[PDB]
Amino acid sequence: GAKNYYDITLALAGICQSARLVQQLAHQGHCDADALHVSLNSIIDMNPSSTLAVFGGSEANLRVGLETLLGVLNASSRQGLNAELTRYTLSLMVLERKLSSAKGALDTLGNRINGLQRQLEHFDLQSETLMSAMAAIYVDVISPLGPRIQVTGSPAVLQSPQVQAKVRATLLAGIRAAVLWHQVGGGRLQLMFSRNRLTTQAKQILAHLTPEL
């Protein structure tokens, strides 16, 4: 309800989970299938009753994001594989701010997302058809609002249109988490001023998820 770090940490973890799945897809051509399922579902899972409900109601569904958030906030090379994750997280945050400023854009986005029912009737969420349809929302509605997010990895892997579609759909999940992040009190300054609170909160959730350790 009132602004709190538990909810802000969860929404940031959703942004970071998109960043990490993109990195996996760009280098390997495949990613954590359970995490991708959670992130893609967050796009279509209508009228959530809490922040955690966006991600299916269980903290375990954000494990990838919560681990990623720890390195994005505290790992400080501006280089290495870890720095790719920071670049993607910040680029999604920048693009979301452009989206939320652009008159009519969030309305267009919602209408396009609900229109995925045109294909969901016949095809599963993780199918090529749906991945392509999700990618087209990102490319048609969001990406034009700034210079492209630069995705690198294995150049030949990234030549696959199926990989490109999975990457764009995962970016759309990242934008959707960034909208939530701002709705629950996150933002540029709040992040500058709360890196430890967020880090501590993420490590507490990861401990809660691991009673055997």
DSSP state, residue 146: S
Helix axes of 5-28 and 81-101: crossing angle, nearest 10 degrees = 120
- State the resolution, in angstroms: 1.6
Please tell me the distance from the alpha carbon of residue 42 to that of residue 53, in angstroms, as a whole number: 9
Residue 54: closest CA among 22, 7, 95: 7
Experimental method reported for this structure = X-ray
Residue ranges and CATH numbers for the domains of the chain are 1-213 (1.10.3890.10)
Please tell me the distance from the alpha carbon of residue 32 to that of residue 39, in angstroms, as a whole number: 11
- CA 158 from centre of chain: 19
Please tell me the distance from the alpha carbon of residue 181 to that of residue 185, in angstroms, as a whole number: 7
Give the number of other CB atoms < 10 A from CB of residue 138.
Answer: 24
Per residue, the 3-state secondary structure of the chain, as one string, reads CCCCHHHHHHHHHHHHHHHHHHHHHHHHCCCCHHHHHHHHHHHHCCCCCCCHHHHCCCHHHHHHHHHHHHHHHHCCCCCCHHHHHHHHHHHHHHHHHHHHHCCCHHHHHHHHHHCCHHHHCCCCCCCHHHHHHHHHHHHHHHHHHCCCCCCCCCHHHHCCHHHHHHHHHHHHHHHHHHHHHHHCCCCHHHHHCCHHHHHHHHHHHHHHCCCCC
Residue 63: closest CA among 27, 22, 34, 28: 34
| Cα Rg, the chain, nearest whole Å | 16
Please tell me the distance from the alpha carbon of residue 174 to that of residue 57, in angstroms, as a whole number: 18
Intra-chain end-to-end CA distance of the chain, in Å: 31
Please tell me the distance from the alpha carbon of residue 154 to that of residue 27, in angstroms, as a whole number: 5
Tokens of 24: 């996996």
Tokens of 23: 């990195």
DSSP state, residue 56: T
Tokens of 61: 């569904």
Name residues whose C-beta falls within 8 Å of residue 94's C-beta, 6 or more positions apart in sequence. Answer: 146
Please tell me the distance from the alpha carbon of residue 19 to that of residue 25, in angstroms, as a whole number: 10
Q: Would the CA dihedral through 22, 24, 29, 31 be positive or negative?
A: negative
Please tell me the distance from the alpha carbon of residue 59 to that of residue 119, in angstroms, as a whole number: 29
DSSP codes, 3-24: --HHHHHHHHHHHHHHHHHHHH
Tokens of 181: 């992040």
Name residues whose C-beta falls within 8 Å of residue 150's C-beta, 6 or more positions apart in sequence. Answer: 87, 91
